Amino acid sequence: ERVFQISFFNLPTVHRIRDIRSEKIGSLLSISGTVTRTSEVRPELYKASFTCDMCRAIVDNVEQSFKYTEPTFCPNPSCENRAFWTLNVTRSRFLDWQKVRIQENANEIPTGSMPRTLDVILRGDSVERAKPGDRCKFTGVEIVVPDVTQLGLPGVKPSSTLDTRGISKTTEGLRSLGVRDLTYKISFLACHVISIGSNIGERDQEVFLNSLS
Amino acid sequence: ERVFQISFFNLPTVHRIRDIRSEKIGSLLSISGTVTRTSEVRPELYKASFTCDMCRAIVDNVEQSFKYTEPTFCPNPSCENRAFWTLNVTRSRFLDWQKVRIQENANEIPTGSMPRTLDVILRGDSVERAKPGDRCKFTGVEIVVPDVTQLGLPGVKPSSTLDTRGISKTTEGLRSLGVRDLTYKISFLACHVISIGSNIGERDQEVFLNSLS
Amino acid sequence: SEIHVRISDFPTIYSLRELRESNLSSLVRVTGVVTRRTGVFPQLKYVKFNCLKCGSILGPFFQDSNEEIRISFCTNCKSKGPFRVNGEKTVYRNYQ
Ligand SMILES: [Zn+2]
Ligand SMILES: [Zn+2]
Ligand SMILES: [Zn+2]
């Protein structure tokens, strides 16, 4: 199956990198910035294939929601264990992935502040349309990415305990539970990339004249 | 597939129960004796079906050579372990099996000796053709059966050590070997059973007159 | 929560002496005189386990009468630890 990508462009407003707020997470939006760093084109696990460890039958086309997931269904009737799996990289399906770092434009910087950066992810055909040192307008979704950096920051960091109210227990004998941190940073996933001129306002001449009207 | 059985009869000589010797093991032979005990007709594992424990694929039609065997081939490419299997009783194929105990005839008994018994196995259509208290002529193969009874008997009992001459070893550190006893008793596996009259020389009369010429 | 269907008037009638391996895993109607019976015993029907690491009681599983059933995953500890059967929450059926 061919993987389809919808690219939106010509949004009415373009937002500054400092205008990014938490209420826009999960929303289509346009930003502009100067590309400072670009990464190698890499494969991303789109549709993985796993084999259950003791069933040893193949399953495929399991969707990946950002961080790496494993299925717990296992429609094979052989097992009674959901958690244990292994992943093969050859039968898995991949997507193109690039991380490009962008910076605040010079005129967009406030009076005394330093420029701040943002890591925006390009996938599919949008990969390698951004080059270091130019001004690019990205249209895409504001996403949120796990961040272990915020551990020492002041303020209460949200945590996530598993609720235990409908579990029957016995004190038979022979009390451990797992809690995960909810700390995140804002990133961007751009479906469309357009390169604005770095100025205020392809070697063959036949190529160049065809672009002009 | 149908299981076919060949029954041989009318052997030129019939052997007494005391004429049984070790030279005749694995040979077609005829004996006569008085049936004293007969057992329930039971199923015998002819062609078993196993599943490899970690492959969990089914295999069938594995021949059984007397005592219970497990395959070491495992043509499934999933495993690298030969020894570990499990057996299912439902998919397995079975056969008629009856153990009937026979005794020396009164005229065959020597001058001061006590009568000695022999356990003869009937399979297939030959089962239930032997009844307690009658004289039967069995034609079949003289077989040999493992016997733990002979442990305290005088004389050297053969043992079976594994030979270790073509095994490379290292004294890396961190010497146990398995030996099994070869002790046996002679039994009989009869393909044909015919009941001689208990005398020296079916209620309906229509059945009886049809037998007479 | 259980209905047992009793098949009546099976046509073929076998004696006990004519049972063979072809009758195995099949329906058979035989005549006979009862000689002895055991006491009624509880047999596991809906088996409930508890994990020794966590103490939680894991949901019931139906027990096949042919073979023993076992458990290998906790769903609360995500462990293969020692699981014990507690007869207080386990449901039973009569056996004779
Ligand atoms: Zn499985
Ligand atoms: Zn195997
Ligand atoms: Zn547990």
XYZ file of C-alpha atoms and ligand atoms in Angstrom:
525
model
C 0.000 0.000 0.000
C 1.284 3.432 -0.993
C 1.615 5.835 1.932
C -0.199 9.093 1.156
C 0.708 12.504 2.585
C -1.478 15.621 2.562
C 0.431 18.907 2.498
C -1.411 22.092 3.453
C -0.062 25.511 2.497
C -1.069 29.175 2.171
C -2.264 29.516 5.757
C -3.648 33.025 6.439
C -1.138 33.791 9.213
C 2.428 32.685 9.933
C 3.380 32.442 13.597
C 6.654 33.438 15.217
C 8.724 30.793 16.982
C 8.065 32.588 20.286
C 4.315 32.720 19.647
C 4.133 28.937 20.074
C 1.841 28.100 22.990
C 0.535 24.903 24.542
C -3.067 25.383 23.378
C -1.957 24.893 19.759
C -0.628 21.368 20.389
C -2.231 19.009 17.895
C -3.299 21.792 15.529
C -2.417 22.778 11.978
C -0.256 25.885 12.033
C 2.434 27.783 10.127
C 5.831 28.894 11.467
C 8.876 30.531 9.889
C 12.524 30.222 10.843
C 16.142 30.076 9.777
C 17.468 26.557 9.188
C 20.736 26.143 11.080
C 21.200 22.363 11.204
C 19.864 19.501 9.101
C 20.223 15.777 9.701
C 20.803 12.728 7.539
C 17.741 11.174 5.918
C 16.825 8.269 8.177
C 14.237 5.468 8.196
C 11.398 5.645 10.715
C 9.377 2.630 11.861
C 5.987 3.286 10.294
C 4.382 -0.192 10.013
C 6.329 -2.708 12.078
C 6.273 -6.501 11.921
C 6.653 -8.609 15.063
C 6.766 -12.273 15.962
C 5.437 -13.514 19.289
C 8.319 -15.124 21.156
C 6.700 -18.482 21.904
C 4.068 -18.538 19.149
C 6.746 -17.698 16.527
C 4.173 -16.654 13.916
C 4.519 -13.462 11.894
C 2.245 -10.423 12.190
C 2.525 -7.177 10.235
C 1.123 -3.678 9.674
C 1.076 -2.587 13.322
C 0.798 1.197 13.535
C 3.436 3.141 15.470
C 2.311 6.217 17.425
C 5.568 8.210 17.775
C 7.570 6.244 20.397
C 8.056 2.535 19.779
C 5.041 0.344 20.558
C 4.430 -3.395 20.773
C 1.056 -5.118 20.247
C -0.770 -6.824 23.108
C -3.548 -8.438 21.048
C -1.754 -11.399 19.404
C -4.639 -12.941 17.406
C -2.654 -16.184 17.222
C -4.448 -18.692 19.487
C -1.233 -20.440 20.544
C -0.114 -18.075 23.306
C -1.616 -16.819 26.523
C 1.067 -14.111 26.939
C 0.555 -10.649 25.460
C 3.644 -8.689 26.485
C 6.521 -10.729 25.034
C 7.416 -10.052 21.385
C 10.364 -9.491 19.103
C 10.734 -7.111 16.166
C 12.391 -7.857 12.818
C 13.767 -4.899 10.871
C 13.719 -6.466 7.400
C 9.990 -7.174 7.079
C 9.083 -3.869 8.734
C 7.876 -0.894 6.697
C 9.664 2.439 7.035
C 9.182 6.109 6.202
C 11.612 8.904 5.414
C 12.561 11.040 8.411
C 14.648 14.175 8.859
C 15.143 16.466 11.848
C 16.001 20.050 10.957
C 16.792 22.653 13.598
C 15.462 26.154 13.016
C 16.183 29.417 14.781
C 14.391 32.698 15.334
C 14.806 35.164 12.492
C 16.885 38.250 13.253
C 14.010 40.737 12.993
C 11.736 38.470 15.046
C 14.043 38.435 18.107
C 12.834 40.534 21.077
C 14.718 43.422 22.609
C 17.147 41.652 24.941
C 16.431 37.976 24.444
C 18.688 35.368 22.897
C 17.400 33.431 19.866
C 15.654 30.154 20.668
C 15.621 27.046 18.497
C 13.046 24.447 17.484
C 13.428 20.943 16.068
C 10.978 20.302 13.220
C 10.518 16.857 11.659
C 10.129 16.395 7.904
C 8.676 13.170 6.515
C 8.154 11.715 3.066
C 8.566 14.095 0.149
C 9.226 17.112 2.379
C 12.603 15.637 3.362
C 15.719 17.540 2.126
C 13.730 20.613 1.050
C 15.406 22.555 3.885
C 19.026 23.712 3.653
C 21.230 25.279 6.356
C 21.257 29.063 6.349
C 17.971 29.886 4.608
C 14.588 31.119 5.805
C 11.841 28.511 5.555
C 8.108 28.555 6.191
C 6.892 25.256 7.648
C 3.230 24.264 7.715
C 2.413 21.388 10.009
C 1.170 20.116 13.339
C 2.487 21.232 16.708
C 3.447 17.998 18.472
C 4.841 17.212 21.899
C 7.934 15.102 22.599
C 9.115 13.398 25.835
C 11.893 15.305 27.591
C 13.974 14.055 30.537
C 15.703 17.471 30.711
C 12.957 19.005 32.905
C 13.827 16.862 35.952
C 15.683 19.574 37.873
C 13.370 22.425 36.908
C 11.356 24.216 39.610
C 7.649 23.554 39.838
C 5.517 20.449 40.173
C 6.123 18.042 37.298
C 3.100 15.875 36.406
C 3.468 12.169 37.120
C 1.336 9.213 36.071
C 0.391 6.466 38.526
C -1.691 3.419 37.667
C -5.061 3.570 39.418
C -5.832 0.625 41.724
C -9.497 0.687 42.764
C -11.057 -2.269 40.936
C -8.345 -4.842 41.662
C -9.076 -7.532 44.233
C -6.034 -8.344 46.363
C -5.072 -10.776 49.130
C -2.425 -10.419 51.853
C -1.190 -13.978 51.359
C 2.452 -12.882 51.443
C 5.665 -14.297 50.040
C 3.755 -4.116 46.993
C 5.571 -2.514 44.050
C 4.038 -0.154 41.484
C 5.336 1.770 38.474
C 4.980 5.523 37.955
C 6.085 7.382 34.817
C 7.009 11.043 34.358
C 4.965 13.379 32.169
C 7.592 15.873 31.007
C 7.494 17.161 27.459
C 8.814 19.764 25.039
C 7.071 21.301 22.046
C 8.184 20.187 18.585
C 6.831 20.592 15.061
C 5.934 18.049 12.374
C 5.848 19.853 9.026
C 3.928 18.403 6.097
C 4.881 21.287 3.785
C 8.180 23.159 3.439
C 8.646 26.301 1.344
C 11.916 28.248 1.232
C 11.455 32.004 1.487
C 14.340 34.067 0.164
C 17.032 34.835 2.725
C 17.148 38.309 1.159
C 14.589 40.999 1.969
C 12.947 40.710 -1.453
C 19.662 25.807 -11.669
C 22.998 26.490 -13.354
C 21.607 25.912 -16.854
C 19.929 28.963 -18.367
C 17.235 26.824 -20.009
C 16.093 25.666 -16.567
C 16.097 29.261 -15.245
C 14.148 30.797 -18.148
C 11.423 28.147 -17.850
C 10.652 29.326 -14.309
C 10.090 32.923 -15.426
C 6.865 33.891 -17.167
C -4.114 -45.628 6.071
C -5.351 -49.092 7.014
C -3.181 -51.248 9.264
C -2.657 -54.678 7.689
C -1.746 -57.789 9.684
C -0.424 -61.086 8.312
C -1.343 -64.183 10.312
C 0.737 -67.299 9.676
C -0.581 -70.711 10.689
C -0.031 -74.447 10.149
C 3.617 -74.401 11.191
C 5.189 -77.885 10.887
C 6.139 -78.106 14.579
C 4.636 -76.686 17.772
C 7.062 -75.899 20.588
C 6.533 -76.471 24.293
C 6.709 -73.450 26.606
C 9.932 -74.873 28.088
C 11.550 -75.276 24.662
C 11.768 -71.493 24.319
C 15.411 -70.484 23.896
C 17.220 -67.217 23.254
C 18.250 -68.303 19.742
C 14.628 -68.004 18.582
C 14.200 -64.343 19.578
C 12.898 -62.450 16.565
C 11.745 -65.590 14.745
C 8.392 -66.975 13.656
C 7.406 -69.874 15.885
C 4.432 -71.791 17.281
C 3.682 -72.553 20.942
C 0.784 -74.199 22.762
C -0.477 -73.444 26.249
C -3.390 -73.191 28.635
C -4.865 -69.695 28.946
C -5.168 -68.842 32.635
C -5.580 -65.055 32.611
C -6.763 -62.604 29.969
C -6.728 -58.819 30.127
C -9.021 -56.042 28.981
C -8.638 -55.009 25.347
C -6.579 -51.828 25.490
C -5.358 -49.221 22.987
C -1.679 -49.311 22.050
C 0.206 -46.299 20.678
C 0.923 -47.362 17.110
C 1.433 -44.055 15.225
C 1.786 -41.155 17.644
C 1.448 -37.423 17.027
C 3.672 -34.920 18.827
C 4.095 -31.170 18.944
C 7.500 -29.606 19.523
C 7.296 -27.574 22.719
C 8.605 -24.269 21.372
C 7.818 -24.733 17.673
C 4.208 -25.711 18.544
C 3.559 -27.243 15.116
C 1.935 -30.648 14.708
C 3.665 -33.763 13.366
C 2.123 -37.209 12.930
C 2.676 -40.835 11.892
C 5.775 -41.466 14.009
C 6.262 -45.220 14.352
C 6.585 -46.703 17.844
C 9.030 -49.572 18.426
C 7.663 -51.279 21.577
C 8.574 -48.874 24.428
C 7.537 -45.252 24.021
C 9.719 -43.181 21.688
C 9.998 -39.500 20.812
C 11.386 -38.132 17.522
C 14.632 -36.167 17.349
C 14.386 -35.010 13.720
C 11.841 -32.153 13.936
C 11.697 -31.073 10.262
C 10.211 -27.753 11.382
C 12.900 -25.085 10.840
C 11.808 -23.012 13.843
C 13.608 -24.928 16.593
C 17.183 -25.877 17.312
C 16.186 -28.339 20.078
C 15.476 -31.997 19.337
C 14.708 -33.555 22.716
C 11.760 -31.511 24.006
C 8.313 -32.586 22.769
C 4.818 -33.252 24.018
C 2.361 -35.958 22.987
C -1.381 -35.553 22.391
C -3.556 -38.638 22.833
C -6.483 -37.535 20.658
C -4.690 -37.158 17.319
C -2.634 -40.305 17.932
C -3.389 -43.639 16.266
C -3.945 -46.767 18.355
C -4.297 -50.534 18.011
C -5.897 -53.485 19.783
C -3.692 -54.836 22.567
C -4.364 -57.755 24.890
C -1.985 -59.536 27.254
C -3.003 -63.133 27.892
C -1.111 -65.336 30.330
C -0.591 -68.956 29.338
C 0.667 -71.904 31.340
C 2.355 -75.199 30.592
C -0.030 -77.997 29.694
C -0.369 -80.807 32.225
C 1.177 -83.485 29.999
C 4.017 -81.166 28.963
C 5.165 -80.561 32.567
C 8.445 -82.322 33.493
C 8.882 -84.854 36.252
C 9.329 -82.641 39.316
C 9.075 -79.116 37.982
C 6.347 -76.587 38.655
C 4.436 -75.144 35.677
C 5.852 -71.917 34.258
C 3.880 -69.121 32.625
C 4.321 -66.843 29.621
C 2.698 -63.531 28.708
C 1.693 -63.430 25.033
C 0.429 -60.254 23.346
C -2.467 -60.309 20.879
C -3.060 -57.407 18.496
C -5.610 -56.473 15.864
C -8.197 -59.107 15.017
C -6.513 -61.721 17.211
C -7.745 -60.141 20.455
C -10.431 -61.894 22.566
C -9.910 -65.182 20.683
C -8.293 -66.580 23.848
C -10.474 -67.504 26.824
C -9.411 -68.556 30.343
C -9.164 -72.300 30.816
C -8.685 -73.558 27.252
C -5.716 -74.862 25.282
C -4.571 -72.486 22.552
C -1.935 -72.701 19.840
C -0.268 -69.332 19.235
C 1.781 -68.584 16.129
C 3.932 -65.496 16.342
C 7.291 -63.898 16.992
C 9.402 -64.486 20.079
C 10.107 -60.999 21.436
C 12.098 -59.689 24.373
C 10.801 -57.304 27.045
C 12.717 -55.131 29.571
C 12.685 -56.576 33.083
C 13.845 -54.812 36.264
C 13.236 -58.044 38.233
C 16.688 -59.484 37.388
C 18.568 -56.924 39.521
C 19.287 -59.254 42.442
C 20.007 -62.344 40.361
C 23.492 -63.895 40.419
C 25.719 -63.464 37.406
C 26.986 -60.493 35.444
C 24.121 -58.446 34.016
C 24.932 -56.588 30.773
C 25.037 -52.806 31.002
C 25.147 -50.121 28.325
C 27.654 -47.276 28.611
C 27.881 -44.456 26.093
C 31.191 -44.596 24.230
C 33.312 -41.430 24.463
C 36.223 -41.640 22.014
C 35.368 -39.068 19.335
C 34.292 -36.236 21.642
C 36.650 -33.307 22.136
C 36.619 -32.006 25.708
C 38.173 -29.182 27.733
C 38.953 -29.045 31.464
C 37.611 -25.504 31.771
C 35.682 -26.347 34.938
C 32.631 -24.876 36.616
C 31.923 -35.490 34.659
C 28.561 -37.287 34.723
C 27.485 -40.046 32.327
C 24.374 -42.194 31.938
C 24.382 -46.001 31.917
C 21.329 -48.238 31.469
C 20.773 -51.908 32.281
C 20.148 -54.534 29.611
C 17.944 -57.013 31.473
C 15.145 -58.771 29.650
C 12.577 -61.548 29.754
C 11.233 -63.539 26.823
C 7.679 -62.814 25.686
C 5.562 -63.762 22.678
C 3.680 -61.655 20.126
C 1.103 -63.881 18.434
C -0.352 -62.944 15.061
C -2.580 -66.041 14.923
C -4.598 -67.709 17.692
C -6.374 -71.053 17.318
C -8.169 -72.775 20.202
C -7.477 -76.493 20.474
C -10.105 -78.467 22.350
C -9.548 -78.783 26.090
C -10.691 -82.394 25.681
C -8.310 -85.095 24.458
C -10.075 -85.428 21.104
C -23.348 -71.498 19.162
C -26.575 -72.160 21.055
C -28.708 -72.127 17.897
C -28.802 -75.444 16.053
C -28.775 -73.712 12.658
C -25.379 -72.204 13.492
C -24.044 -75.595 14.668
C -25.232 -77.625 11.661
C -23.628 -75.155 9.239
C -20.195 -75.878 10.722
C -20.537 -79.614 10.094
C -20.112 -80.882 6.556
C -24.318 -19.888 34.038
C -24.077 -23.480 32.719
C -26.424 -25.823 30.855
C -25.515 -29.476 30.267
C -27.225 -31.269 27.385
C -28.043 -34.939 28.014
C -28.285 -36.943 24.799
C -31.018 -39.569 25.066
C -31.871 -42.663 23.011
C -28.574 -43.157 21.222
C -29.320 -45.954 18.730
C -26.244 -48.207 18.818
C -25.660 -50.163 22.032
C -22.212 -51.588 22.764
C -21.217 -54.063 25.418
C -18.145 -53.450 27.545
C -16.280 -56.356 25.948
C -16.567 -54.995 22.389
C -15.045 -51.536 22.923
C -12.076 -50.901 20.605
C -9.851 -47.941 19.724
C -12.201 -46.920 16.911
C -14.677 -45.913 19.617
C -12.091 -43.591 21.194
C -13.093 -39.905 21.333
C -16.580 -40.891 20.169
C -20.030 -41.279 21.670
C -20.872 -44.746 22.974
C -23.887 -46.231 24.767
C -23.061 -49.185 27.011
C -25.014 -51.311 29.484
C -23.659 -52.331 32.845
C -24.073 -52.961 36.546
C -22.529 -50.446 38.941
C -20.182 -52.143 41.408
C -18.652 -49.276 43.398
C -18.680 -45.485 43.425
C -16.311 -42.977 44.983
C -17.201 -39.975 47.084
C -18.206 -36.728 45.427
C -15.153 -34.524 44.950
C -14.820 -30.847 43.981
C -13.248 -30.407 40.545
C -11.980 -27.003 39.423
C -14.389 -25.316 36.989
C -13.612 -21.567 36.991
C -10.051 -21.359 38.296
C -8.894 -18.164 40.002
C -5.215 -17.490 40.727
C -3.255 -15.026 42.843
C 0.263 -13.712 42.235
C 2.689 -14.085 45.127
C 4.660 -10.970 44.149
C 1.668 -8.611 43.974
C -1.156 -10.328 45.871
C -3.779 -9.469 43.254
C -6.441 -12.002 42.283
C -6.385 -12.675 38.542
C -9.622 -13.229 36.627
C -11.230 -16.654 36.322
C -10.401 -19.132 33.563
C -12.527 -22.084 32.505
C -10.967 -25.448 33.331
C -11.041 -28.172 30.706
C -11.972 -31.499 32.272
C -9.410 -33.335 30.131
C -6.218 -31.581 31.262
C -4.845 -29.257 33.922
C -4.647 -25.550 33.059
C -1.826 -23.200 34.060
C -1.052 -19.480 34.043
C 2.141 -17.675 33.010
C 1.346 -13.930 32.947
C 0.095 -11.615 35.682
C -1.347 -8.550 33.804
C -0.618 -6.538 36.965
C 3.044 -7.340 37.685
C 3.843 -8.319 34.059
C 5.791 -11.245 35.506
C 5.913 -15.033 35.200
C 6.146 -15.430 38.974
C 4.697 -18.176 41.158
C 0.899 -18.159 40.976
C -1.176 -19.991 43.586
C -4.729 -21.296 43.359
C -6.994 -19.964 46.103
C -9.989 -22.215 46.670
C -12.020 -19.434 48.275
C -12.674 -17.645 44.977
C -12.398 -20.709 42.725
C -15.657 -22.253 41.482
C -16.087 -26.030 41.510
C -18.203 -28.772 39.971
C -19.043 -32.213 41.300
C -16.938 -35.201 40.257
C -17.550 -38.909 40.793
Zn 1.392 -15.158 20.757
Zn 10.869 -28.054 16.791
Zn 1.398 -10.112 40.332
